[PDB]
Symmetry: C2
Subunit: 173 residues, 2 copies
Amino acid sequence: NAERRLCAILAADMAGYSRLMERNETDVLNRQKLYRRELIDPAIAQAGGQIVKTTGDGMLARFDTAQAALRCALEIQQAMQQREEDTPRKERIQYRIGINIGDIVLEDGDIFGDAVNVAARLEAISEPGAICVSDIVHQITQDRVSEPFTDLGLQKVKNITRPIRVWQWVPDA
Amino acid sequence: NAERRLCAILAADMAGYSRLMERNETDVLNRQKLYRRELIDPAIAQAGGQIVKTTGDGMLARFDTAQAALRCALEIQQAMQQREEDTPRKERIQYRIGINIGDIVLEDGDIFGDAVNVAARLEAISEPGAICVSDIVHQITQDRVSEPFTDLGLQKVKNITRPIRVWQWVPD
């Protein structure tokens, strides 16, 4: 029924647009529906990945190589910079993205393990429009990608005793 | 016309309900709209705080004392856990709250300065339903507020140079 493998996990969520604005932002919510369909979902497929699920926590996808997770996120984040550049800053749609690696368990279209929790957390602390990757991901990908990353220091993650060293890339702006 | 002063700054946003789900926003907007006016806005007003503004980044409020701000956050977070313990964990509403203190600028219904941005960052990285405060708030409140906090590490805040140490209180 269920297996263990080494996997590249990618978590993503949408930044911004607080529900406390007490307003239905149908225009903005329709744009993101569009990007998911035209930008994200495609880049992920092109890159060999599979979406595992989208939940209240956001979306979770997995890849066979660390490289493919990362080029996929870079592909997404760089296009989003272009796609939203003629929209004013405080109104732009931006995603956050985290990527990690680990032995995790798969079982019935869902994934399990610390390493997944860590991808999710990376997404949450990532800055909007950027990509945060764990140190493991960084040691493997640093030389495969021209884009630069910056050490962010240690990050404690709920129910993981050992904190993780987190590297971040932000777009040229 | 402007004004410079040392303030406690509370940032709060709503966790969860990722829009990558594409669910009907309508229902969740309403529930939060209720909590805002029955639970939140009054707690703040009872504690002597003032709502400064709300935006895409959430709500900012200011208090005259560190303890008032933290008392208010605690009161909100504790209630929200009770008001929501009947509903299923996945369909619950929860806030993240951050609190920082610093020399801000008050001008024309708005609040400006780094201590503000720091408070917004703490809100962002806080656990759903929890409270994150900066070390400064922690050292000023430790001995007047019994609720336990956990040292969460140093935290690089965007465009500020020294990491701030962050303390986190979770509800049980």
